[PDB]
Design a protein around this ligand. Structure first.
Ligand SMILES: CCCCCCCCc1cn(CCC[C@@H]2CO[C@H](COS(=O)(=O)NC(=O)[C@@H](N)CC(C)C)[C@@H](O)[C@H]2O)nn1
Ligand SMILES: [Mg+2]
Ligand SMILES: [Zn+2]
Length: 847
């Protein structure tokens, strides 16, 4: 055994030992319990970043832990390959997105292999290959014929300078984020998944997920946004009907979740597109201007609640069906056409948004709920104003004194008897628009024929292959400019026809890839029945919190769609969910000519602990704040530089020790060095142990007869095994597991292990320590284990707790006063807490 730890000389050998043993290449072996551990697969963007290394090290720790516990562990990796990154790189570099993508995959794959992740590379998928995306085209066609996928006109943000469609997030003050041109609202036909048909199942099935973080489930519930409310119809006042047709001339229908407060409504509000808004605005320029502003907004959903709420009065009035009040109709920017009826009532005394709106416009606030003897102040919102549980109705006529549920039913009764309303369930959830006007994505398998309509491509003709010999130029979506792609014959009649040229939302590929891993070469279906039956669901899913709403909702939805098609047997794709925190780093810059900043990458900087300077010249830089690693402030630390300087195990150890997985992980030069020094210490501890006599049989069995010092070390050892097992298995807090092994090594360092029994215990300590750390730093532990013991580390298995090492050897002593037993220097103090002391047997209190 070499004296000094050298990662470069042991990490490739360990990797070849694992590869040759095919330990990570798993099959559907019915004789070993399965465990499916999945880290969210990466976009092949070019090179790994620290977020990747953190994520996949966490996944590898859990996978290797389960492997040592005897599970048949599938840990697959693949590439989420479609999307805008490659399209832009193409525009920037004059290369095909496919060529850029495949070169990135090859490079990043080598990087992942160099980190020693126990990955089943025979299950690799790349979502941009027709062998993958043919199956989501297949599902699309099946659902399209059932109406679960449908085609409908929708409104998009069109950027006329860049000639591209923009998400709301890419619109800044009504202008495209890159072009700076005013965007145009355009109506275009698009394809939608009818995910609202599954809203109730997606909501209720969250309750099954006892091993999901409660905040992820709360976010999904709020996103789905089910409410149980009341449709209420306010008759349009006789003076307010000009310009109105049909039922819009008769009543204004609203939806409310608080019909118990209907007696306290003081105005109503409609969307900009509502017919009452249109009729009121016909002669009123301020209203026309307000409506135009509302229609031109592009506020992202994440920002909707934060936008300033504004409205304009219409001079039109409706009548409250309960109390007969005439209420003015307002147009408001927070009422969205297409949600419910596009009209709401307002109760400013008991809804905080209505309170602030009414406070702004000096609209009335009417208390109709009381909570105890709490004083109501119309001028200041109090939390109890919105309480639904502990209030009773006041100022509500014959409804006074009722609680929420009784008042709800009473109002429903009154409204239904009048014909003025009825209970109604609503969902915030929108259907999922999947059309993208982009080239680098899965083609939509539709052919447009003027005789037959929008025709799904037959299953025998799938895939619709995306041509890879394309370099986007930026002047519009390439597929629409390629008649060699879109000109075709109709599969139903043989006539002239055109292929759909929009591609699929790339969330589609990540909504089912976890099933494709189960049989990635299966050519007769999305996933083979035998594989789906064996692997079932993902046991452990690991990924970033930014995917907690959309990706997870879509994956759950696709799972239920595939279940209903008879392809899988589970209702939910992911049993346990671990969401990792971001990686952050200090920022540095040097000053600018126009009073700005230009940002320096950390690896090009050297500190002095006073100031910092640039490595190339040694001139001063300015240390700035710490924030998430990104190209924006050039504070990404390249993991390849970390691996080149210290090796894979140091990178993995630092990532796992620096913070618990959910916490933000702060890049630290000294922390990286400390991780490396600990691996050197581990190496030296084993080297020095073996140099004093070589390996012996590890201590096992009855420890009666061991010295106290060695009993104490065995107690620490099995205490540490218990802690580490609970940290890996239950708490998923790997930093504390590492610290526990460090404390064990500290106690070992202070214990004399030179005797025959001491060497047996030292062997037991070191054999446990290297297996406890193997999930985290497998290369060095594999190597050290081989010097300690001739068995296959993965066949020795996870260390077992010896409960006998955890019980302490007590001796029962009799106590007596004046020679008569009255119960049963250290022993003197206990018998007084109960003086001749016959050592260990008798203590006598000279009364
Ligand atoms: C090189 C110059 C730039 C430096 C950048 C530094 C970034 C540091 C950072 C980032 N973050 C956020 C979490 C990142 C997780 C990383 O690993 C997985 C794959 O990320 S991906 O490739 O972006 N693919 C995806 O997120 C999707 N393909 C997953 C699909 C299942 C939907 C996911 O779990 C992610 O959530 N924290 N620190
Ligand atoms: Mg359960
Ligand atoms: Zn046809």
């Amino acid at each position: 055994m070499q004296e000094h730890y050298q990662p470069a000389a042991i990490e490739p050998a360990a990797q070849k030992k694992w590869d040759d043993a095919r330990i990570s290449n798993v099959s559907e072996d019915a004789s070993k319990p399965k465990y499916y551990c999945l880290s969210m697969f990466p976009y092949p963007s070019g090179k790994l970043h620290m977020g990747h290394v953190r994520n996949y090290t966490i996944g590898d720790v859990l996978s290797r832990f389960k492997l040592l516990n005897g599970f048949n562990v599938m840990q697959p990796m693949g590439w989420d390959a479609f999307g805008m990154p490659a399209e832009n790189a193409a525009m920037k570099n004059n290369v095909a997105p496919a060529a850029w993508t495949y070169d990135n995959i090859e490079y990043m794959k080598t990087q992942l292999k160099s980190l020693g992740f126990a990955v089943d590379w025979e299950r690799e998928v790349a979502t941009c290959k027709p062998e993958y995306y043919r199956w989501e085209q297949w599902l699309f066609t099946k659902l399209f014929e059932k109406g679960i996928v449908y085609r409908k006109n929708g409104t998009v943000n069109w950027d006329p300078v860049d000639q591209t469609v923009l998400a709301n997030e890419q619109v800044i003050d009504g202008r495209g984020w890159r072009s700076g041109a005013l965007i145009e609202k355009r109506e275009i036909p698009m394809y939608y998944f009818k995910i609202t048909d599954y809203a109730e199942e997606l909501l209720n099935d969250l309750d099954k997920l006892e091993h999901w973080p409660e905040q992820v489930k709360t976010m999904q519930r709020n996103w789905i946004g089910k409410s149980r409310g009341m449709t209420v119809r306010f008759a349009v006042s006789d003076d307010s009907k000009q310009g109105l047709e049909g039922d819009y001339a008769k009543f204004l229908q609203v939806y409310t979740t608080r019909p118990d407060t209907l007696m306290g409504a003081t105005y109503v509000a409609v969307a900009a597109e509502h017919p009452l808004a249109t009729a009121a605005a016909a002669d009123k320029p301020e209203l026309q201007a307000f409506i135009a502003e509302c229609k031109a907004g592009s506020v992202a959903e994440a920002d909707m609640a934060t936008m300033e709420k504004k409205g304009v009065p219409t001079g039109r009035y409706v009548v409250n069906p309960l109390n007969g009040d005439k209420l003015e109709v307002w147009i408001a920017n927070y009422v969205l056409w297409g949600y419910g009826d596009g009209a709401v009532m307002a109760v400013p005394a008991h809804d905080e948004r209505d309170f602030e709106f009414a406070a702004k416009y000096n609209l009335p606030k009417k208390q109709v709920i009381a909570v105890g003897d709490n004083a109501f102040d119309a001028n200041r919102w109090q939390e109890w104003y919105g309480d639904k549980e502990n209030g009773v109705l006041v100022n509500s006529g014959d409804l006074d004194g009722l609680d929420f549920q009784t008042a709800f039913d009473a109002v429903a009764a009154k409204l239904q008897s009048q014909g003025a309303g009825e209970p109604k369930t609503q969902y915030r959830l929108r259907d999922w628009g999947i059309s993208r006007q982009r080239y680098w994505g899965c083609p939509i398998p539709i052919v447009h024929c003027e005789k037959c309509g929008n025709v799904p491509v037959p299953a025998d003709q799938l895939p619709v292959v995306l041509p890879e010999n394309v370099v986007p130029d930026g002047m519009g979506s390439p597929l629409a400019k390629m008649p060699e792609f879109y000109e075709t014959s109709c599969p139903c009649c043989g006539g002239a026809a055109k292929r759909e040229t929009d591609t699929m939302d790339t969330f589609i590929e990540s909504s089912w890839y976890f099933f494709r891993y189960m049989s990635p070469k299966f050519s007769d279906g999305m996933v083979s029945a035998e594989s789906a039956k064996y692997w079932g669901a993902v046991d452990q899913y690991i990924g970033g919190i930014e995917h907690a709403i959309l990706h997870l909702l879509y994956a759950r939805f696709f799972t239920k769609l595939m279940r209903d098609e008879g392809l899988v047997n589970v209702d939910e794709p992911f049993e346990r969910l671990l969401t990792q925190g971001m990686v952050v780093c200090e920022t540095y810059y040097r000053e600018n000519d126009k009073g700005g900043k230009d940002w320096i990458n950390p690896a090009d900087v050297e500190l002095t602990p006073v100031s910092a300077v640039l490595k190339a010249d040694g001139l001063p830089v300015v240390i700035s704040g710490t924030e998430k690693m990104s190209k924006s402030k050039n504070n990404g630390v390249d993991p390849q530089e970390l691996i080149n300087a210290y090796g894979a195990d140091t990178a993995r150890l630092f990532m796992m020790f620096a913070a618990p997985p959910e916490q933000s992980l702060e890049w630290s030069d000294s922390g990286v060095e400390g991780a490396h020094r600990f691996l050197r210490r581990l190496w030296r501890t084993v080297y020095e142990y073996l140099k004093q006599g070589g390996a012996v049989k590890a201590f096992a069995g009855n420890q009666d007869g061991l010295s106290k010092e060695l009993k104490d070390l065995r107690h620490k050892l099995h205490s540490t095994t218990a802690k580490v097992s609970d940290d890996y298995g239950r708490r998923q807090q790997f930093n504390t597991a590492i610290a526990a092994v460090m404390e064990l090594l500290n106690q070992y360092d202070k214990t004399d292990t030179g005797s025959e029994q001491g060497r047996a215990v030292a062997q037991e300590v070191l054999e446990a320590a290297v297996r406890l750390l193997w999930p985290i730093v497998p290369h060095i532990c594999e190597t050290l284990w081989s010097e300690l013991n001739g068995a296959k580390l993965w066949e020795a298995g996870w260390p077992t707790v010896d409960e006998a090492a955890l019980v302490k050897s007590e001796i029962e002593v009799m106590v007596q006063v004046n020679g008569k037993l009255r119960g049963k220097a250290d022993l003197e103090a206990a018998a007084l807490a109960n003086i001749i002391v016959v050592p260990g047997r008798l203590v006598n209190i000279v009364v």
